[PDB]
Amino acid sequence: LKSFTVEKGIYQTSNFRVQPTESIVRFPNITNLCPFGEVFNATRFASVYAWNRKRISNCVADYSVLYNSASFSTFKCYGVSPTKLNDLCFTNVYADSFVIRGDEVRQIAPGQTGKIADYNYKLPDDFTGCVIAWNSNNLDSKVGGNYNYLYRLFRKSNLKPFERPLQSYGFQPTNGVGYQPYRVVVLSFELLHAPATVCGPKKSTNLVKNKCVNFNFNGLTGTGVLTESNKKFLPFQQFGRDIADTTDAVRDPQTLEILDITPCSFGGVSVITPGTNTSNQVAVLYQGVNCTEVPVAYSTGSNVFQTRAGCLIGAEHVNNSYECDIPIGAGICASYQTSQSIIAYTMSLGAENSVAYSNNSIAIPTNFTISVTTEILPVSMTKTSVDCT
Amino acid sequence: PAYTNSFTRGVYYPDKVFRSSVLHSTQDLFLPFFSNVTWFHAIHKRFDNPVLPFNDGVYFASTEKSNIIRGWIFGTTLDSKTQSLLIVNNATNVVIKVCEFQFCNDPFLGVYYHKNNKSWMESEFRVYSSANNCTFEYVSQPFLMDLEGKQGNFKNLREFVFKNIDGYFKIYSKHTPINLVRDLPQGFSALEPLVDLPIGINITRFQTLLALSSSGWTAGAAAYYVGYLQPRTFLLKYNENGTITDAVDCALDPLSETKCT
Amino acid sequence: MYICGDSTECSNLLLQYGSFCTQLNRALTGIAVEQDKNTQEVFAQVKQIYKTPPIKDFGGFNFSQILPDPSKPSKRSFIEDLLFNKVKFNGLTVLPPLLTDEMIAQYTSALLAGTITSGWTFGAGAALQIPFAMQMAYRFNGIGVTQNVLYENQKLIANQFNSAIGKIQDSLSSTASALGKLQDVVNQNAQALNTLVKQLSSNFGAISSVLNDILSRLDPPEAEVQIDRLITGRLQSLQTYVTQQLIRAAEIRASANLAATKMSECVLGQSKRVDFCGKGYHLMSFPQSAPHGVVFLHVTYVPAQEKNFTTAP
Amino acid sequence: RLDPPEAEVQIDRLITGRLQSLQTYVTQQLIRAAEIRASANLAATKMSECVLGQSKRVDFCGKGYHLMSFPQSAPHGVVFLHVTYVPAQEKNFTTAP
Amino acid sequence: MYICGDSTECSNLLLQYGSFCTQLNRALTGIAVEQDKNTQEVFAQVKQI
Ligand SMILES: *[C@@H]1O[C@H](CO)[C@@H](O[C@@H]2O[C@H](CO)[C@@H](O[C@@H]3O[C@H](CO[C@H]4O[C@H](CO)[C@@H](O)[C@H](O)[C@@H]4O)[C@@H](O)[C@H](O)[C@@H]3O)[C@H](O)[C@H]2NC(C)=O)[C@H](O)[C@H]1NC(C)=O
Ligand SMILES: *[C@@H]1O[C@H](CO)[C@@H](O[C@@H]2O[C@H](CO)[C@@H](O[C@@H]3O[C@H](CO)[C@@H](O)[C@H](O)[C@@H]3O)[C@H](O)[C@H]2NC(C)=O)[C@H](O)[C@H]1NC(C)=O
Ligand SMILES: *[C@@H]1O[C@H](CO)[C@@H](O[C@@H]2O[C@H](CO)[C@@H](O[C@@H]3O[C@H](CO)[C@@H](O)[C@H](O)[C@@H]3O)[C@H](O)[C@H]2NC(C)=O)[C@H](O)[C@H]1NC(C)=O
Ligand SMILES: *[C@@H]1O[C@H](CO)[C@@H](O[C@@H]2O[C@H](CO)[C@@H](O[C@@H]3O[C@H](CO)[C@@H](O)[C@H](O)[C@@H]3O)[C@H](O)[C@H]2NC(C)=O)[C@H](O)[C@H]1NC(C)=O
Ligand SMILES: *[C@@H]1O[C@H](CO)[C@@H](O[C@@H]2O[C@H](CO)[C@@H](O[C@@H]3O[C@H](CO)[C@@H](O)[C@H](O)[C@@H]3O)[C@H](O)[C@H]2NC(C)=O)[C@H](O)[C@H]1NC(C)=O
Ligand SMILES: *[C@@H]1O[C@H](CO[C@@H]2O[C@@H](C)[C@@H](O)[C@@H](O)[C@@H]2O)[C@@H](O[C@@H]2O[C@H](CO)[C@@H](O)[C@H](O)[C@H]2NC(C)=O)[C@H](O)[C@H]1NC(C)=O
Ligand SMILES: *[C@@H]1O[C@H](CO)[C@@H](O[C@@H]2O[C@H](CO)[C@@H](O)[C@H](O)[C@H]2NC(C)=O)[C@H](O)[C@H]1NC(C)=O
Numbered sequence A: 001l002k003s004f005t006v007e008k009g010i011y012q013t014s015n016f017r018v019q020p021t022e023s024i025v026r027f028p029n030i031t032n033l034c035p036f037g038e039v040f041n042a043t044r045f046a047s048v049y050a051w052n053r054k055r056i057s058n059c060v061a062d063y064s065v066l067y068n069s070a071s072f073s074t075f076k077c078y079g080v081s082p083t084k085l086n087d088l089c090f091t092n093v094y095a096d097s098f099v100i101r102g103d104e105v106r107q108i109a110p111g112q113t114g115k116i117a118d119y120n121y122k123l124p125d126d127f128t129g130c131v132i133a134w135n136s137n138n139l140d141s142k143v144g145g146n147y148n149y150l151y152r153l154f155r156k157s158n159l160k161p162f163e164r165p166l167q168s169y170g171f172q173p174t175n176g177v178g179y180q181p182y183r184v185v186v187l188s189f190e191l192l193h194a195p196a197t198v199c200g201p202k203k204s205t206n207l208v209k210n211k212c213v214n215f216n217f218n219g220l221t222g223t224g225v226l227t228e229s230n231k232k233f234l235p236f237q238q239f240g241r242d243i244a245d246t247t248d249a250v251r252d253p254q255t256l257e258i259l260d261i262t263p264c265s266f267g268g269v270s271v272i273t274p275g276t277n278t279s280n281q282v283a284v285l286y287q288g289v290n291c292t293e294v295p296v297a298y299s300t301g302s303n304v305f306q307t308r309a310g311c312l313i314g315a316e317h318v319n320n321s322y323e324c325d326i327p328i329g330a331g332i333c334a335s336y337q338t339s340q341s342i343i344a345y346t347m348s349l350g351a352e353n354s355v356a357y358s359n360n361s362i363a364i365p366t367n368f369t370i371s372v373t374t375e376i377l378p379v380s381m382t383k384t385s386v387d388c389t
Numbered sequence B: 001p002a003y004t005n006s007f008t009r010g011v012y013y014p015d016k017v018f019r020s021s022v023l024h025s026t027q028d029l030f031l032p033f034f035s036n037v038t039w040f041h042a043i044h045k046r047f048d049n050p051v052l053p054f055n056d057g058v059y060f061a062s063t064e065k066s067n068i069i070r071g072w073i074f075g076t077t078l079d080s081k082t083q084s085l086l087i088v089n090n091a092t093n094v095v096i097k098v099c100e101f102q103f104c105n106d107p108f109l110g111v112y113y114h115k116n117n118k119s120w121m122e123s124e125f126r127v128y129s130s131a132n133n134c135t136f137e138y139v140s141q142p143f144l145m146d147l148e149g150k151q152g153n154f155k156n157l158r159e160f161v162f163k164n165i166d167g168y169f170k171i172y173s174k175h176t177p178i179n180l181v182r183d184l185p186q187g188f189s190a191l192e193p194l195v196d197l198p199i200g201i202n203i204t205r206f207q208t209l210l211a212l213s214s215s216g217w218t219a220g221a222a223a224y225y226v227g228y229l230q231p232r233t234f235l236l237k238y239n240e241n242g243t244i245t246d247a248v249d250c251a252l253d254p255l256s257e258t259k260c261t
Numbered sequence C: 001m002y003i004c005g006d007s008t009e010c011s012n013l014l015l016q017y018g019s020f021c022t023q024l025n026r027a028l029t030g031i032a033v034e035q036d037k038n039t040q041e042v043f044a045q046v047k048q049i050y051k052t053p054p055i056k057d058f059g060g061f062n063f064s065q066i067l068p069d070p071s072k073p074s075k076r077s078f079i080e081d082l083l084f085n086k087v088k089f090n091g092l093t094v095l096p097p098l099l100t101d102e103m104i105a106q107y108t109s110a111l112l113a114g115t116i117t118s119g120w121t122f123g124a125g126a127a128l129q130i131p132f133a134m135q136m137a138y139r140f141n142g143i144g145v146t147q148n149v150l151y152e153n154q155k156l157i158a159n160q161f162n163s164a165i166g167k168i169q170d171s172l173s174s175t176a177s178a179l180g181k182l183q184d185v186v187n188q189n190a191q192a193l194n195t196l197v198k199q200l201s202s203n204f205g206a207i208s209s210v211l212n213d214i215l216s217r218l219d220p221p222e223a224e225v226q227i228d229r230l231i232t233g234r235l236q237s238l239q240t241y242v243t244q245q246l247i248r249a250a251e252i253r254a255s256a257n258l259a260a261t262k263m264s265e266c267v268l269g270q271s272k273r274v275d276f277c278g279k280g281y282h283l284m285s286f287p288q289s290a291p292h293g294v295v296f297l298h299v300t301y302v303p304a305q306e307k308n309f310t311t312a313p
Numbered sequence D: 001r002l003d004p005p006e007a008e009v010q011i012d013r014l015i016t017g018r019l020q021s022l023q024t025y026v027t028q029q030l031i032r033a034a035e036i037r038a039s040a041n042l043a044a045t046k047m048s049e050c051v052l053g054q055s056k057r058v059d060f061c062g063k064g065y066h067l068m069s070f071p072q073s074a075p076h077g078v079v080f081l082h083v084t085y086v087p088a089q090e091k092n093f094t095t096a097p
Numbered sequence E: 001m002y003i004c005g006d007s008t009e010c011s012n013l014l015l016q017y018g019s020f021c022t023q024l025n026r027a028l029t030g031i032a033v034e035q036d037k038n039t040q041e042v043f044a045q046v047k048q049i
């Protein structure tokens, strides 16, 4: 009120709402996984000039094993990060397998010197694709030596990017530092070329009920209280909408059950007080709020009187009847009376009376009183003019 | 062909939302009411099997038996330059496989099995030449809709509606029983989303596949209609269970327009 | 809550405009108080609540169709029950009325009993009893007809009145278009609320209508630009709704004042104003309670069969 | 602080806000004036029908039976003093038609 | 028509503002009917010429 003194009455104040307890996430637990095991357990890689390209789809491109695996030592992502890879989706990933010199790790960097780079396989200067390099010397090394991967492709004429020497003595487990073969996995992804269909797995949490919580089903976010429902969705239907076009029922991806959504309770708060003259005691009203739940958590309380208007605290309920003093609602009024305290009761409409009506009786007055009464009516309000400019 | 008019066919669930006793209004591609639709003669002397344009959908329906119509062909060039969809089927399950299959200029099976002399004969099976190039494949859940023997009577209406947008090729369909062997009796029935494909290819022309040699041939009793879809506004009446029951086109006549308003 | 449901950034941005929410709340509170004032003014016009005597010996008239029936658990009359039968999830609350339907019914019953037992005296002072035949004679004398007419056609008049109430009850039970005004009021309020809720799905020129989606999609400059656009749109919608409510409230207040005047001038007495309390020569009236409104039953006297005569001044 | 060109954006924002405030104020004033005019009409009618003559309407000019009234001025309004006659003390008898 | 009559582009742009046009049309129609009701109730008081 921006004042140091408040007149008798009932006044509005801040709003009241229930905060969510925690967050819950549910997703359709994965059963389709890409055959990464067989992908990286290949007995022998193909020719360098015939590097494979396997488009990956209809299968989750899980990367946790990569993080979990301790075999990998070098793992750099120059375009993304593993932390945000959880909520980042790639349209499609191509698994490209080839055999390259161990010392060419330095020259594989995009936009790096060395004509060997574009002589064997040119990389675009903006190739931010992550490169995985885990030692596989014994796995991809033979006792005699891999002479198949000849590197005599030293043609003078340069080969344009997608226009349409023999320094390898043998890949053996005894190879020295920088010469041992290393398995290379190419993370190639594109944008705005096809709908996203390959993503990392998303974890799930146990379902809860009867708690104002934050939920996220298949990208549908909100806040509410989850509960079992008898609605019978169709086999191909997922959500439920009301006439106002607001979500009111969802189907859990994992367990095919229909759960209702109800907003967390909230309502306004008001303060009832007599004039600051008489006292400073007050009583608060919670508009349209359940009463026997808030006190579960005026710390003493000891005065809770449920009413159709909502929970009421600080006033004692007396079952007499008087005229309305500070209206509350639904035929309830509060007033200050003595042992001074605030009381709440049911308003009285007036004193009972019963006319002694008959069929041969009439009453006639004997004399009179002249009465004078007033009446106040507004007539006009102060003029006012304003200069717009 | 005979230009029969569809009375109330060609309505499908536009989304995956549940609504009960609500008269939702939607704006999507649809088959207008009372629009004449071609009635081809699905014969093999006389050979009717042309390539038809694919313009934002096709209301396909038939009353065949034992899977006379084996599959469909979609594409934009159909010359191995662009990947084309193939939905050939037989025996166990569906064998969807999309590749740049070598298309013959006359790639039709056309076999009389159990037609006149009650015998299963396949004079030639050269429908396949070679899979020179392939880039994608996806076999859906192994299944086969009721496309089995029905000589007893044409008590079936295999209604289909196709559509392709945003790289997604969707297919809706169901089994609608019929009682009168005469032309399509008037009735109402909604289409469910049967399968969705994230193929992400381009289709501008499509061709159907028919298996209904010339010895003692007479024009066979088989036909399939092919309508087209236009963008229109519809009003859909949901029941208690969430299944649509009726609909009124809002661009047909003044009383329908007032109903929509 | 309505504009920026669960968004600290949105709340911070709205702080720029500021006092708009306070202005809107003040206006709506004013309207809410005015409603209770209207109901109180219209109905509460009796200092004491009278009650009808046990015996209904009203000179042959029959008010059983309008007086309360204690047998029913709800203490409402037949006509009131007929009328009653005939007629929170997004930060919008509905406050209950101050006076409950039981209190309204008690007030109406008090008024009716006081009328039928004491004429109009209770409207000016203490209630005074008077037989109903005497009261009818006084009313007739009021409209310019001698008393012997009533004292000789009492039985016929009673039969006509009873038949009239029978017919009115049957007409109300059968027809359904009599309560157009109240039905229209309810429909208009519901439609306004529905449109206000539906306004939340519009882009208003923003990329999307989901605040969390915008926040998680775009970065912090276009993000706040879109948020500002949405805030502007929703604020405009709220202002329009509030203005509509204000105008409708003014109209309803005018109607309530008219109803209060009708009650005071027809029920508590007899009026010489033409066509104010019903067509014809007014005799008396009876009130009834209906949801969000009131109903009257004007009783009037109408000549029927005429003749020819020759006159001299 | 700013140059000519950029300051236009800030000026536009301020203009928009202040214009909205003015429009809201004017609308509120219009509605309030309509209400006050209705009250003034009622007051004029009361004056004409009670002060300049006796009124037979019930509860219009005062409670009870009306006799006569007086006006009195006041800041931005008027005040009446209704005079009424009220029966007081009742005694019962027996009656016949 | 008043806002940007005869422009499909602006029609599409205006589609994103909600039901303002519907509200305005409803209000104006209400006033238009009210006028006829006013005249009828003021004048037609005797149903016999
Ligand atoms: C005053 O008028 C009232 C309107 O009828 C009378 O109330 C009922 O009137 C009927 C017939 O006149 C009386 O006789 C029997 O009524 C029962 C059922 O009672 C209902 O009667 C009528 C018609 O059914 C109904 O409108 C009332 O509301 C009653 O609920 C039926 O089996 C027959 O109709 C039969 O005639 C009732 O005794 C009487 N019922 C009451 C008052 O509950 C009332 O009689 C009149 N007062 C008198 C004559 O002193
Ligand atoms: C993902 O989560 C769903 C659950 O929403 C898994 O399905 C559930 O799997 C469990 C374990 O089989 C089932 O509970 C038990 O199943 C055994 C199976 O023999 C049964 O003997 C027990 O009596 C008990 O029922 C549960 O019924 C089943 N429920 C559902 C809705 O699927 C599913 O396996 C997980 N993988 C997915 C969905 O890919
Ligand atoms: C006012 O009330 C009554 C009711 O109509 C009218 O007269 C009443 O008539 C009955 C029947 O005569 C009386 O009840 C008793 O009847 C028995 C019959 O055996 C008789 O022996 C008793 O002496 C008694 O009459 C009732 O007492 C009587 N009540 C009255 C007040 O007269 C009367 O005509 C009505 N008068 C007016 C002005 O309304
Ligand atoms: C779902 O649709 C049905 C009908 O449209 C609504 O009522 C359902 O009517 C069928 C009629 O058979 C009920 O089937 C049951 O049959 C047995 C005998 O086989 C009988 O004993 C039962 O009393 C009942 O008639 C069915 O139970 C009943 N309910 C459902 C869900 O089908 C139904 O109200 C609609 N439910 C919803 C959520 O929309
Ligand atoms: C004439 O009118 C007066 C006005 O009442 C009545 O005289 C007596 O008045 C009281 C009610 O004021 C009647 O009830 C008596 O007082 C109260 C209220 O009723 C209560 O204690 C009892 O009910 C008590 O009986 C009283 O009956 C009545 N005395 C009579 C009739 O002898 C009366 O209605 C009329 N008769 C006379 C002689 O005044
Ligand atoms: C009352 O008078 C008019 C006409 O004046 C008289 O009507 C007769 C009743 C009688 O008094 C005659 O001497 C007068 O002519 C009645 O209307 C007339 O009815 C008849 C036939 O219609 C005839 O006189 C005229 O055609 C009518 N008047 C006309 C045409 O101007 C009227 O019906 C009488 N009221 C009643 C209840 O009978
Ligand atoms: C592919 O080979 C790897 C071998 O590394 C398998 O993953 C595990 O590797 C660690 C290395 O420390 C082991 O100790 C485990 O024994 C390996 N798991 C096994 C053999 O099951 C991976 O499972 C293989 N993927 C396949 C066969 O699909």
Ligand SMILES: *[C@@H]1O[C@H](CO)[C@@H](O[C@@H]2O[C@H](CO)[C@@H](O)[C@H](O)[C@H]2NC(C)=O)[C@H](O)[C@H]1NC(C)=O
Pocket (backbone or CB within 6 Å): A366, A367, A368, A369, D088, D089
């Ligand atoms: C009814 O009559 C009696 C008789 O006078 C009045 O009683 C007197 O009223 C005057 C008021 O000025 C007092 O001064 C007297 O003391 C009262 N008692 C007497 C004169 O004996 C009474 O006021 C009248 N009441 C009404 C309502 O008219």
Ligand SMILES: *[C@@H]1O[C@H](CO)[C@@H](O)[C@H](O)[C@H]1NC(C)=O
Pocket (backbone or CB within 6 Å): A005, A275, A276, A277, A278
């Ligand atoms: C206390 O009472 C009076 C006189 O009735 C009033 O003038 C004054 O403002 C009141 N003060 C407070 C603090 O309520």
Ligand SMILES: *[C@@H]1O[C@H](CO)[C@@H](O)[C@H](O)[C@H]1NC(C)=O
Pocket (backbone or CB within 6 Å): A317, A318, A319
């Ligand atoms: C008033 O009446 C009885 C008295 O025992 C009891 O219900 C209680 O004290 C009061 N009623 C309520 C609702 O408190």
Ligand SMILES: *[C@@H]1O[C@H](CO)[C@@H](O)[C@H](O)[C@H]1NC(C)=O
Pocket (backbone or CB within 6 Å): B003, B005, B034, B035, B036, B037
């Ligand atoms: C469709 O074409 C046939 C051919 O005459 C015609 O009879 C029919 O009216 C056409 N249908 C419509 C809706 O125009």
Ligand SMILES: *[C@@H]1O[C@H](CO)[C@@H](O)[C@H](O)[C@H]1NC(C)=O
Pocket (backbone or CB within 6 Å): B088, B089, B090, B091, B092, B093, B094, B095
């Ligand atoms: C359908 O025909 C060929 C084999 O002849 C091939 O497409 C496929 O194997 C067949 N379908 C099934 C389910 O075998």
Ligand SMILES: *[C@@H]1O[C@H](CO)[C@@H](O)[C@H](O)[C@H]1NC(C)=O
Pocket (backbone or CB within 6 Å): B112, B115, B116, B117, B118, B119, B120, B121, B213, B214, B215, B216, B217
């Ligand atoms: C007649 O029967 C033979 C044996 O199966 C079959 O090859 C031939 O197609 C049949 N002729 C016709 C017209 O069907």
Ligand SMILES: *[C@@H]1O[C@H](CO)[C@@H](O)[C@H](O)[C@H]1NC(C)=O
Pocket (backbone or CB within 6 Å): B133, B134, B135
């Ligand atoms: C089709 O054309 C060439 C043939 O070598 C090759 O790109 C591949 O087989 C096909 N195209 C793809 C997979 O993009």
Ligand SMILES: *[C@@H]1O[C@H](CO)[C@@H](O)[C@H](O)[C@H]1NC(C)=O
Pocket (backbone or CB within 6 Å): B200, B201, B202, B203
């Ligand atoms: C046909 O489809 C492709 C997507 O596969 C897309 O480029 C476009 O819609 C069409 N192709 C061209 C070159 O326009």
